[model samples]
Target: APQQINDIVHRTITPLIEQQKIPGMAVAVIYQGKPYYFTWGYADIAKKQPVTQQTLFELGSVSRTFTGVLGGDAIARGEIKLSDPTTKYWPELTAKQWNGITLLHLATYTAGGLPLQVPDEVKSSSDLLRFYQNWQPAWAPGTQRLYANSSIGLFGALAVKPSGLSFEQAMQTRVFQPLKLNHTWINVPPAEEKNYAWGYREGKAVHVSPGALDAEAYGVKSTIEDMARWVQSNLKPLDINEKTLQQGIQLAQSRYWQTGDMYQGLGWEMLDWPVNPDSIIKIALAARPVKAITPPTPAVRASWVHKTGATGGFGSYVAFIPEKELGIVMLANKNYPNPARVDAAWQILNALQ
Candidate 1:
């Protein structure tokens, strides 16, 4: 019963909330085949609008997982190859720095030093291409791993060229349609505006500002309800009931590279289960590029898979244990430190166990 689930969620997450000074949060769980939600605090505090299952929260980097799934789907369909060059998608970008960089490199954030944010001069798509065209790689692909919005954003854009769809359309065609993620979107339409939460920054109301390559990088907004199911797709692929969908999910979560104690999946990050809170935080805050695992392998049973997404005023985290058929989705209007996000999630997941 949700009442019992609420009891569990409240006692587990409330302490962290008080400490983090969070405004509104949606805490949802997918346990085996069951779903539970605890909608806490206010979504629009000034108007007393509380969060509901339908409230949309900006997903930030968690959106990268969807892009990863798209690449995996394309790979499964034989529409593209991991070794395909960026130039294949944008023909004019036939530059030396892009010579050895491949789709895998873009998806993994291993296309040398693309940096954490795209340059300020990159105001439009053409400018972005020039940035890529003019830039030089800091290291060879697979030589070092660095986390950057630019790399994956470009991957998200290029990954769709074979199908000739815009980034949003490709995600809808390749990922949202297959996963049946009805409410997830790169661009939130006007009709859904009422369901979008008013994010808070230090007691002031704010929202995400679309920047360069925003949609591909950090522009997804979805409900906790939708995200729980998305987590389920990763946690228990068979739950979706399609062989190809399962294959794509498996491919997205496949173990492709290792950086320190962490394993890199397409868009998700994998760690051995029974992870300590501090270590999880360290890994979550880490930057990586390491030896690639050719012909990436499926995730092992003893893995704790997770991803974190944060916008200017919202923080989101999703994590699951395939072995346990357990997953948790945390969405907050406050853009709190990510350690708070990870520790709180680990606490909630452990309590539910």
Candidate 2:
């Protein structure tokens, strides 16, 4: 089985790595609920440090999935409700644009028209709220699904409001701690900085610099072992005994809306598992580009879920099939194209199944 996986990587990933001149990448796979890890290239190209299971990589927008999970936890604990108005948590968000928005809208990126990045003038929580006061929606809430980090970043802040803990602390209490994910962090502690993987754009090495919305949007850093466990948790949903949290994880992955060929879960793009490999590949390629969204079909179900994340210096992709009990995480210092990562995961998943 190892040799089979090796063959797949050699045939597909090796050439891409060579062509792209990537400094390093870490791949983790969950097969039959067991994790297998492989590392390629360097953690530090200059120092010649090899990437290992301990190497930390910025998770980018994949961090949004954790926000979805945390929201589920809040819902389960009666801290929030999906149907509740988002403004119920943050009364300061009094803009008319927010009138019809719900917690679910923000989580699913259907909170009307939001840009992909935060507004340049928004430098603090107060500034975000102030921006909303004058903000106008390009489309009515739930009518269009525009991909926007500002939507989820606001949702993350709202999700943690009732806990009275900082966003990082709330994530630890609700996600990392309960999941026993020892190596995950919203901000890597000082000692662990040694293990953090520096990233590259073009060919120059770079470091993660927190932005105005880092805490709520794209500030997570984790190791392969921790991420493998994250993949494992999703593959074996409801594996935990806490009924509400179980319901919450399920809620996070529920097919809340349909946009074209893909179903939009709370924070991931979902596909029907047990599907033809070609069909899955086609859907992934089609869905990666930003598109307009209309109301979803009456009812839909998905067996596999995927999400891609990227920052200035790092790129990450995650996918899991619930029925097969399999998942994969691909992390690279260089932001590889989404289709390439999807193809690699699909290839490996086909072989493992």
Candidate 3:
């Protein structure tokens, strides 16, 4: 079985890496509950560093999923409630402009078409208050679904408020620490910088640089071994002692809103089980209008839930089927296209099936 997995992973991803000219890749899979990790190419061509189990790859938008889990944990602890308005944490914004917005609305990306980015004015914490006070919604909250980092990024901030910590700190103290994801980081510690992969853009070396809201939305870095561990943990909870953390992971994977057959979890995108690579890709990645599910119908179900994340020089994908207990995680130095990742991911999953 391990050999078959290796054959499939090599068969499926070799073309992708070479075709895309990826400097390196960390491909990991969870097949019937067994975690397998594979690496190829180089982490840095100049340094002659090979991609390894510990080489960290930028997670990009996948970082939002961690924030989602954090939010779910916050709810589990009764520190915050989904229906609570953002104003609950920050009272500077009046009811007139911000009343309809709830943590639920933000978590579901249905907070009335928030801009794809927090207002440029929101370069710092002080700007958030002023921006919300002046913010106007294009549609009534819960009346539309629009995917935006601005929404989830704000959701992360609110999620961590009761912890009396910054978003990165809460992620560390609450999720990463509780989950024991030792290799994951919002910022790579200085001593381990050598293990951080050098992300590439068109063969030129690069890496994620600082930006506001970036940390919550697209700034995580981790290794294939840890990612496979993430996939394994998601397939089933590992930390039995942390009830809220386990509950939070479950909540992050549940469907809250529907657009056609597709569902939106906290920060995940979900589709019915026995995933048809095409169907999930279309609704999840294609340009489709949001068929708003006003007053979301949240419930647990068996399905394929996945998310894609990318930056200027990095790309990553995470998908898992609960019923099948199989998952795939793909990380690349080059910011290749999403469809390619989805296609290759399905190939590996289908191979296992």
Per-candidate TM-scores read 0.94, 0.91, 0.93
Which residue pairs show collisions in model 1? 145-288, 145-289
Tens-digit lDDT track for model 3 on 48-148? 99999899999999888888988988999999998898889777667486886899888878887777766555676677667766767788877667778
**Between the candidate structures 1 and 3, which one is better when assessed by TM-score?**
1
RMSD of 1: 2.1
- Local distance difference test scores for all models: 0.82, 0.78, 0.82
Clashes of each: 2, 0, 0
Off by over 4 Å in 3: 119-121, 282-301
Lowest summed lDDT over 10 consecutive residues: which window, candidate 2? 282-291
Stretch of 10 with least lDDT, candidate 3: 282-291
lDDT of 2 by residue, 1-353 (tens): 47776677567678778876778998888888888888898888888888899999988999888888888888888988878898898887776778879988887777777667776767876787777676677777777777778888878888888888888888887788878899998888999978888899878888777676676778898888999998887766568766766666777876777654677766767777666545554222111223433433321233768888888889998988877777889889998777777777888787777
* TM-score of candidate 2 versus the correct structure, residues matched by position: 0.91
Clashing pairs in 3: none
RMSD to truth, every model: 2.1, 3.4, 2.4
